Amino acid sequence: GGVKVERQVFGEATKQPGITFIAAKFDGILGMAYPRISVNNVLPVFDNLMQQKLVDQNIFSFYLSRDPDAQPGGELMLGGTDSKYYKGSLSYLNVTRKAYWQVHLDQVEVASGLTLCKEGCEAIVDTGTSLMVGPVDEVRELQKAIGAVPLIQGEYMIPCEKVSTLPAITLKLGGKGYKLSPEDYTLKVSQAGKTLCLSGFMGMDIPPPSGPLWILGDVFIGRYYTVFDRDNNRVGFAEAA
Amino acid sequence: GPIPEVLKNYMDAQYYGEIGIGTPPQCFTVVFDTGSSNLWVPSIHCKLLDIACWIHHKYNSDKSSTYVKNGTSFDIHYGSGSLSGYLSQDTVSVPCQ
């Protein structure tokens, strides 16, 4: 059945410039991060639901299909996990700062032996960001190591033929490594009208205060089922199904 | 609980599901963003400048028995775009029930 979170405050957008929200397939955004970053300190939808006590466990989980045809395209479950979408047991690690769903990255290693973030860095787990992002210069390095060429502004491309032979990249999160094979981190698109492959890593620096940060976006979540546990303030990963 | 919410996948770039705002509910598709903390949808009072609401759904306050005005102005900047409007209050149904 649905829930009805009542007396939720939301904004009504009257001006939104740029190509971005014109092109975007979606009408708006429901943010599910911490109230600490809420504009006008509005109480967020999950916090209001939580307060109203409408779910037994204050957790929510994402499954995202990586096949464009495959229905359902993904599944969010409000108040529990779904076992047909992941396999194994979930691996948890705690939130390091409560604003975004921020977590500690131990290091990122391209198999060839390019180790980025050796010494550890910070990452936010974000369902609203399509690709993986990381600091410009570090990502450039990563990109050249797997032979992707620049398009514009930190977006990279690989001739689709090569996908099948690139190195796997491992993100070590909380002890164990999470592995992204080439077909996981490349997106087959159609610019002009043709089969092109986007590199699934784009470089963009987030300024301090909050930055510099890696952003584990849908590319990651597309391979590893993610649970956001507001009750324990920990993120949980498992290989998807 | 638990409430499954089916998302649509668009190019492995955009994942979005449907929610309803209002009594009776008006149905909006939204990304459930773990990277921000606000809910907003276009208003029917959007400026002709907002090319985005020429083609997205627009929330019409007058058709909701549960609408409480608020009027405070917000402004949000995403890595991908900014926007602004005024805040309002109503019932959110996940899904459009």
Binding site: T20, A24, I29, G31, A33, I37, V39, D126, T127, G128, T129, S130, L131, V133, E155, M202, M204, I206, I215, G217 | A13, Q14, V31, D33, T34, G35, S36, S37, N38, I76, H77, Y78, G79, S80
Partner: peptide, 6 residues
């Protein structure tokens, strides 16, 4: 792409 609240 799209990177959502800086």
């Amino acid at each position: 792409x799209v990177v959502x609240a800086x």
